[PDB]
C-alpha cells in the first residue's frame, strides 16, 4: 500500500502581473507542513502551478495524493493540455513553445511520482487548508524575496 497524504494549494497575486505568492500544505497522518514563498513579478496562474509543484516535490517516495485547489487553470492543464503536449512535444497548434511550459514540465515530473486523487474545490473560502493556504500566499505576495526567472514577461 501507499502512504496517504493530502496536499492544498493556492496561489495569490497583487497584479497581473504583479508581485505573488503560493502557499500549500502537505498533511501526512494529521501532522502538517507549510510552503510558501514570493515573488516580485509573476502571474495568479504561476503561483497556482508553484503551489503544486513544491509540495509534491517535498515527497520523497511514491505516495497517494489527495490534491485539493481551487486553480481552475490547474484544472485545464491537467485536463485538456497534459496529454497532447506530451504527444505534441509541449508546443502548441502552431509548433511554438507553450505558454509556462517550464512549470507544467516540472509539475508534470512530480505528479508522475504519485497516484494522484483531484480534489477540485470549487472555492478556497471555506475548506479550512485551502483558506490558510490562501493568506499564506497572500503573505508571500505581501514580501516578495525572489525573481520569478521563469515568467516571460509580456507587457
Ligand atoms: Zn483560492
Not at 502551478?49 to 485539493?68: G, N, P, Q, T, Y
Not at 511554438?96 to 512530480?110: E, F, G, T, Y
Not at 499564506?136 to 505581501?142: E, G, K, Q, T
Amino acid at each position: 500500500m501507499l502512504k496517504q497524504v493530502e496536499i492544498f494549494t493556492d496561489g495569490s497575486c497583487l497584479g497581473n502581473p504583479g508581485p505573488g505568492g503560493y502557499g500549500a500544505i502537505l498533511r501526512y497522518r494529521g501532522r502538517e507542513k507549510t510552503f510558501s514563498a514570493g515573488y516580485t513579478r509573476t502571474t495568479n496562474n504561476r503561483m497556482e502551478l508553484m503551489a503544486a509543484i513544491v509540495a509534491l516535490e517535498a515527497l520523497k517516495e511514491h505516495c497517494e495524493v489527495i490534491l485539493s485547489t481551487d486553480s481552475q487553470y490547474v484544472r485545464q492543464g491537467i485536463t485538456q493540455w497534459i496529454h497532447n503536449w506530451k504527444k505534441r512535444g509541449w508546443k502548441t497548434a502552431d509548433k511554438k513553445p507553450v505558454k509556462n511550459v517550464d512549470l507544467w514540465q516540472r509539475l508534470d515530473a512530480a505528479l508522475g511520482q504519485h497516484q494522484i486523487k483531484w480534489e477540485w474545490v470549487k472555492g478556497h473560502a471555506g475548506h479550512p487548508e485551502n483558506e490558510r493556504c490562501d493568506e499564506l500566499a497572500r503573505a508571500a505576495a505581501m514580501n516578495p524575496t525572489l525573481e520569478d526567472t521563469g515568467y516571460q514577461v509580456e507587457v
